[PDB]
Design a protein around this nucleic acid. Structure first.
Ligand code: A1BXB
Ligand code: ZN
Lengths: 382, 719, 336
DNA sequence: TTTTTT
């Protein structure tokens, strides 16, 4: 019963090929190529989740279940980053043999394997409302889909391209927008698309650049690639899929630690930032200083807390060297404590110590006739 | 990698506020009904128009240019439902560039397109009817009625066009069992305001206050006729206005039809309207709905950043600032002399000044015979009609007016103003060719050769070749066309591999295949080819085009006829293409365009691909008798030099190197701040005088408002 | 030139709405408390008992304080013995200390806080040389400054305190101090950049951006030990070459001039360029008549700029209406 | 002085 969320992209227009697959028509059906997948079982602590996930993603390759319900998806919006297209059951020995082969290596899944395994009880149920809306619109399940395919092709294609808006963009687009590194290309594509919204958490509201930065600081050990294939030597999806499936950031500890590390990093970062912004907002609200010195404080404080050196130390304090949460090498961050130690506690104190800190006084002592002299010389006459 | 960190973790509170601002259901009675917009159509004058509140929300994202406000928009687009718009086409394309550089963003259009602005609305009397606000305190209803009376000649036309179009649409689907979410997909070409309630307007300070209400008003329109699911959910628009409040202004132009004196007054932009109006700052609750981005990234200079801080925040001008900006002052005759500061954009505070300087620059580049820019002459025409200037002269209460006196000022109001009043040109000579019932006029506009020019209006590029150096699916076809035009044996050893006495110069087959499959067959081949032979042995331009070109003088000899992008002026080939000849009034001038060969100017993009473009045609329709009729259509090229411009237009786009020419007496510190902030580095900045040392009219009213916003616990500051 | 003996602060209060007099008098008592704390902090060897030290208050006429614009206040404090304050900047610093000390006492902010739109009360620009301050018992050409009596909590002579507001010495900057053995002259309080925010920001600037060497050090590279006329000599030729190319309509005017050192700030050396005798140098800009144009002065300004390179500027001071009268303007800055 | 929307 292991459930897999899979993102695929055929050779050409994936929408037309997918619709033809749903209609069981042998006209256009490019073997489908899966490139990113999230496997989960209905349920947890952080280490309980890590053990469950490490069990899920078999280190040798593939998954560990006997029957697999796989929900294929495309880049689309319903704000969801993907959109499901068709769901397939895999209970027979031949079905799971094809799924393990296509999930651990990357060999495309032929139309036969999928077409013989559509969960018609649910597959055509996912897009049934789209069928109804198309019927109503053109007026002004699978037999209905075929009939609507025949009647007005242009509107069917336009509807299936507006929904699932991104569909297939380009092989090069994925290598462009999901980092040049293999770590990014596998892990960030898994999280930002098929793992962010499902698992919830703060990462659901974070952007692609932020998630790529988090992946960059997820610096797990890097073993060399057995075929020494470079990440930029990829042209079609048969290369990206092969790179991702036979990668060692995809079938084990790293694939299990990334979702937990996203949550951990954000929690540590917000703990320090939110503390620093509490201090910032309070001091801003109660400053009562001149306009120029106010701007000087606000810029100075934002620098003194969020300067490039302080930020570098903080990001090196959250960088991991292992995905196991109980064996993590991340250590407490010095950002807020250092910022409070130098700038903030001292400003809270000056809030008549302010005079002692900012007085630099020069009082020259003149005793004798020189006092009388200085008086008449520098004061209005008696 | 650490640069994004502050934005990444500070945009989240912004995102966690826009969501509740967009998911707040209104009371049933407060929702503007369809009958409201039905009555608006019935109303003729904007006087009996009933006081009607149109609910809306705002979230203000403000800051210096280079703040990074674009990162906030990026995060919003990928997380929230939103319709991203722009105040100018350039700003919309800039946002598209910066949103498609991270993920997918649908084609970003202007807010004007979103609320239905069309061609005839461009020259419309937008300031006619009066209003004595029954106000102080000004009710929101009164403010909205003022902004609708301001735009009566636009709101009324939009309402009439939307209403009298008829009803199907969502009304149909909603009754599936009596699925509107899948309605915009199945029923296409539907307005984009029917699928979201978060409207992001970038550089919204370029829009006047009249637009704010207008947008909200229009929103409700497009959600009432179509009976959108958001209208059934009783949601209300939230306008995320992103822009710089102290580096951007909006101006209103009115043309008096007897004095022929086109005047341009200053106006209250959306940002200033929202920040400085006590009624809007309370209804919209700007305190809990304001984000100021505070960091200027492209500033590696401490003193320059300090100067930007004092100018933007209205801080007192001290002696030290005067001494710092003293190091930029260079004489008046040094900036204006074309021999100095080559490649530096020069800003003036008058369109006449730019028209003088460009002519002087052309004189310099012609007399000193600089082969870098072979100055050339190119025709631009105009087409007035006898009936138009007969009836309009009749209606202006003055039937005596010469055509040249008609073109005394309406030349600006006949096309894109920016280049129209900032171009050196000959006298627009006209003779009476009443063959197609027209008065034709013709002159020529002098450009420079091979300069980084910019496209002003919307043009249709037709790529003909690639004029780039050896360094380097239809794009793959064009690359195949390039290869079609593609030691002595050692690089030849790898050349014989391409072959499958230069080995490439022995035998060949047409480089560009026709079918896509054959193109891909020959694609990997040519891709590996250059990598191998060129590796051994790159500055000479690999000039390769689909057709042989001969640039005699400036016009090229392509035999076969068949805005943000920084293009390069190349030459005026004629090679009449039917692609640009989509001519269908317009046909009366189409016949003359067939008669007189229309020159198509050729431009070179950043990559180096040569592109032949179409011309531009624009109408003048304004009148006083409420009779908008097509008077005159102006056929010209619509290209800008990017070498000299006005300070006011400089607000829109950032510049590399800047020399500012300041006119004394007209010194406004906001103009100085805008002019000085267009360049990243203070090193490459020269100026006429010192704006800090001379008498300057400073208007520090919005500055204190930002300062009080920076002094509020509920305003989110992002570093 | 003279020594300041009374702390005279100009309190410009902004109002959201009209105020009751009792609230104002209580706020003034709180202001007295805060100012006396600030004074005992600034002058540490004095003895300011904050229940007997006389502070004097004057309000501008605008009972019901019919104030629609501002409550014009003037606060006069005797400088405690044996101190005397010298310098415009020293009293500027005293004013900043008092201002940031009165917005610390919770009583003052609790009393007047709901009324003051901008919490800034003290103006610090009325202490420069040549700047005037309206005396109490005088009007404006709209409000005769009249005393408002805030008696010290433990004042042992009330009639004396009342008949102390009428003595001009109590409200004059350089009044005679009212048998002196010792006298301590507070003549410097650091400067504008001694605020912790200013001192921290300056230190962060050096760490992150770099050191901007002072004018003297930069000039020392070009064999100048401040002598400045020594470099100004050779600089005159370059400046004249610049003007007789870019500004030629007055060319033959600075052929023979002698640099006269006039103003010396540690980052700004201004040398006048008077010729040989009273022939004035025609103003380079804003072309005037024969006599009007020849009513201007010229200066040369050496400063440090860019990547620590000595920047030389030509500047003018014109005596005509078209140019800012008696204000210094810049024309070109050249490298050296 | 003063741009911009199709
Ligand atoms: C040592 C230092 N470097 C600091 N940086 C990186 C900055 O100012 C960066 C900056 C500079 C200018 C602006 C701006 C932008 C528009 C209008 C006014 N201003 C914003 C941000 S701040 C300090 S500090 N506060 O320690 O002295
Ligand atoms: Zn002068």
């Amino acid at each position: 019963p292991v459930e897999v969320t899979a993102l695929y992209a055929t050779d050409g227009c994936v929408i037309t090929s997918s619709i033809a697959l749903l209609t069981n028509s042998l006209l256009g059906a490019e073997p489908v190529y899966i490139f990113s997948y999230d496997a989960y079982t209905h349920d947890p602590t952080e280490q309980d989740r890590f053990e469950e996930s490490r069990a899920l993603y078999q280190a040798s390759g593939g998954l560990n279940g006997d029957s697999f319900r796989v929900t294929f998806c495309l880049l689309g919006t319903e704000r969801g980053r993907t959109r499901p297209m068709f769901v397939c059951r895999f209970e027979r020995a031949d079905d799971v043999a094809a799924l393990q082969d296509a999930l651990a290596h990357g060999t495309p899944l032929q139309p036969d394997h999928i077409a013989a395994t559509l969960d018609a009880e649910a597959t055509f149920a996912l897009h049934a409302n789209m069928i109804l809306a198309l019927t109503v619109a053109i007026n002004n399940g699978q037999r209905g889909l075929t009939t609507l395919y025949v009647h007005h092709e242009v509107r069917v294609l336009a509807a299936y391209r507006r929904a699932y808006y991104g569909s297939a963009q380009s092989p090069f687009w994925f290598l462009s927008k999901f980092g040049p590194d293999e770590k990014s290309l596998v892990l960030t594509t898994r999280y930002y698309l098929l793992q962010a919204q499902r698992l919830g958490g703060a990462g659901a509201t974070y952007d692609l650049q932020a998630i790529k930065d988090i992946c960059a600081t997820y610096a797990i050990p890097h073993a060399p690639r057995p075929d020494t294939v470079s990440a930029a030597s990829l042209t079609s999806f048969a290369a990206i899929t092969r790179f991702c499936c036979t990668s060692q950031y995809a079938r084990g500890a790293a694939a299990a630690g990334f979702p937990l590390y996203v949550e951990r990093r954000i929690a540590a970062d917000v703990r320090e930032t939110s503390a620093l912004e509490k201090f910032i907002t309070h001091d801003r609200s109660c400053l009562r200083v001149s306009d120029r010195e106010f701007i000087t404080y606000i810029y100075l404080a934002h620098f003194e807390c969020f300067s490039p050196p302080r930020l570098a130390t903080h990001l090196r304090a959250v960088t991991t060297h292992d995905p196991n949460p109980a064996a993590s090498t991340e250590q407490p961050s010095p950002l807020g404590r250092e910022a409070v130690e130098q700038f903030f506690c001292h400003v809270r104190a000056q809030l008549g110590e302010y005079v002692k800190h900012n007085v630099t006084p020069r009082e020259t002592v003149l005793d004798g006739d020189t006092a009388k002299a200085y008086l008449r010389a520098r004061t209005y006459a008696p | 990698a650490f640069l994004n960190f502050t934005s990444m973790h500070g945009v989240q509170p912004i995102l966690k506020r826009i969501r509740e601002l967009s998911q707040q259901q209104l009371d049933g009675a407060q929702v503007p009904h369809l009958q409201w917009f039905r009555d608006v159509a019935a109303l003729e004058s904007p006087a009996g128009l009933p006081l009607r509140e149109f609910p809306f929300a705002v979230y203000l994202i403000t800051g210096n240019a280079g703040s990074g406000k674009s990162t906030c928009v990026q995060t919003i687009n990928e997380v929230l439902d939103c319709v991203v718009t722009g105040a100018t086409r350039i700003a919309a394309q800039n946002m598209y560039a910066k949103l498609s550089g991270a993920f997918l963003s649908r084609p970003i259009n202007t807010i004007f397109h979103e609320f239905g602005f069309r061609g005839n609305h461009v020259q419309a009397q937008l300031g006619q009817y009066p209003y004595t606000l029954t106000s102080n305190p000004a009710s929101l209803e009164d403010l909205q009625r003022r902004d609708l009376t301001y735009y009566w000649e636009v709101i009324l036309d939009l309402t009439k066009r939307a209403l009298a179009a008829s009803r199907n649409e969502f009304r149909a689907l909603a009754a599936l069992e009596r699925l509107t979410r899948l309605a915009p997909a199945t029923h296409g070409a539907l307005p984009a305001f029917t699928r979201s309630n978060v409207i992001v307007i970038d550089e919204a300070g370029l829009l006047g206050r009249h637009l704010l209400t207008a947008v909200v008003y229009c929103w409700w329109m497009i959600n009432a006729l179509y009976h959108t699911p958001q209208y059934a959910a009783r949601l209300r628009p939230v306008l995320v206005c992103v822009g710089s409040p102290t580096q951007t202004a909006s101006l209103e132009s009115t043309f008096e039809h007897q004095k022929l004196r086109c005047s341009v007054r200053q106006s209250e932009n959306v940002l200033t309207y929202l920040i400085c109006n006590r009624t809007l700052r309370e209804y919209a609750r700007l305190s809990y709905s304001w984000a100021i981005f505070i960091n200027n990234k492209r500033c590696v200079e401490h003193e320059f950043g300090n100067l930007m801080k004092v100018l933007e925040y209205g801080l007192p001008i001290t002696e030290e600032h005067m001494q710092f900006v003293d190091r930029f002052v260079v004489p008046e005759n040094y900036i204006t002399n074309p021999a100095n500061l080559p490649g530096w954009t020069r800003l003036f505070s008058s369109h006449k000044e730019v028209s003088a300087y460009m002519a002087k620059l052309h004189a310099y580049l012609k007399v000193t015979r600089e082969g870098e820019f072979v100055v050339f002459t190119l025709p631009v025409l105009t087409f007035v009609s006898v009936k138009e200037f007969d009836e309009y002269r009749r209606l202006t209460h003055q039937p005596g007016l010469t055509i040249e006196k008609w073109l005394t000022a309406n030349a600006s109001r006949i096309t894109n103003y920016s280049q129209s009043q900032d171009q050196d040109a000959g006298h627009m000579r006209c003779e009476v060719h009443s063959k197609q019932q027209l008065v034709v006029a013709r002159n020529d506009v002098t450009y420079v050769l091979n300069s980084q020019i910019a496209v002003t209006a919307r043009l249709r590029k037709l790529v003909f070749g690639f004029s780039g150096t050896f360094r380097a699916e239809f794009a793959y076809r064009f690359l195949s066309r390039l290869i079609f035009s593609g030691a002595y044996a050692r690089m030849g050893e790898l050349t014989a591999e391409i072959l499958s006495l230069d080995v490439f110069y022995c035998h060949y087959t047409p480089g560009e295949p026709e079918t896509t499959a054959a193109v891909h067959t020959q694609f990997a081949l040519l891709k590996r080819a250059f990598l191998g032979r060129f590796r051994i042995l790159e500055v000479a331009p690999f000039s390769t085009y689909v057709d042989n070109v001969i640039f005699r003088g400036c016009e090229m000899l392509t035999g076969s006829p068949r805005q943000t992008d920084n293009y390069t002026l190349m030459g005026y080939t004629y090679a009449r293409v039917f692609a640009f000849a989509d001519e269908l009034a317009t046909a009366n001038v189409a016949e003359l365009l067939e008669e007189a060969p229309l020159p198509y100017v050729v431009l070179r993009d950043q990559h180096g691909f040569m592109s032949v473009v179409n011309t531009n045609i624009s109408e003048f329709v304004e009148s006083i008798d409420s009779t908008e009729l097509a008077m005159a259509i102006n056929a010209d090229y619509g290209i800008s030099s990017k070498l000299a411009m006005t300070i006011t237009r400089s607000q829109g786009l950032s510049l590399d190197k800047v020399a500012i020419c300041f006119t004394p007496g007209n010194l406004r510190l906001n103009s100085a701040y805008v002019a000085m902030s267009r360049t990243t580095s203070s090193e490459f900045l020269r100026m006429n005088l010192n704006p800090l040392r001379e008498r300057h009219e400073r208007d520090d009213v919005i500055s204190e408002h930002i300062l009080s916003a920076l002094r509020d616990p509920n305003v989110v500051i992002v570093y | 030139a003279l020594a300041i003996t009374n702390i005279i602060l100009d309190l410009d209060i902004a109002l959201k709405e009209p105020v009751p007099f009792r609230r104002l008098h209580e706020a003034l008592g709180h202001f007295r408390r805060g100012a006396l704390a600030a004074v005992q902090l600034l002058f540490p060897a004095a003895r300011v008992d904050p229940d007997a030290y006389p502070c004097y208050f004057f309000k501008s006429a605008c009972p019901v304080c019919s104030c629609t614009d501002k409550i014009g206040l003037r606060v006069c404090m005797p400088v405690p013995a044996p101190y005397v304050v010298h310098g415009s900047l020293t009293m500027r610093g005293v004013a900043r200390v008092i201002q940031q000390a009165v917005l610390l006492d919770r009583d003052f902010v609790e009393a007047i806080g709901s009324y003051v739109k901008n919490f800034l009360l003290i103006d610090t620009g009325v202490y420069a040389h040549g700047h005037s301050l309206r005396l109490p018992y005088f009007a404006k050409i709209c409000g005769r400054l009249l005393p408002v009596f805030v008696i010290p909590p433990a004042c042992k002579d009330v009639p004396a305190f009342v008949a102390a507001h009428a003595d001009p010495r109590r409200f004059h900057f350089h009044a005679p101090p009212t048998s002196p053995r010792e006298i301590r002259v507070l003549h410097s309080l650091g400067g504008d950049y001694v605020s912790f925010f200013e001192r921290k920001a300056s230190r962060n600037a050096l760490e992150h951006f770099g050191r901007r060497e002072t004018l003297t050090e930069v000039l020392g590279r070009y064999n100048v030990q401040p002598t400045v006329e020594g470099f100004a000599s050779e600089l005159l030729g370059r400046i004249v070459a610049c003007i007789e190319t870019h500004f030629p309509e007055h060319a033959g005017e600075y052929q023979a001039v002698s640099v006269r050192r006039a103003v010396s700030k540690d980052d700004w050396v201004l040398l006048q360029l008077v010729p040989v005798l009273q022939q004035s140098l025609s103003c380079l800009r804003f072309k005037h008549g024969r006599a009007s144009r020849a009513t201007a002065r010229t200066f040369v300004a050496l400063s440090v700029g860019a990547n620590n390179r000595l920047c030389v500027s030509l500047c003018q001071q014109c005596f005509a209406a078209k140019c800012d009268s008696n204000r210094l303007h810049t024309l070109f800055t050249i490298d050296a």
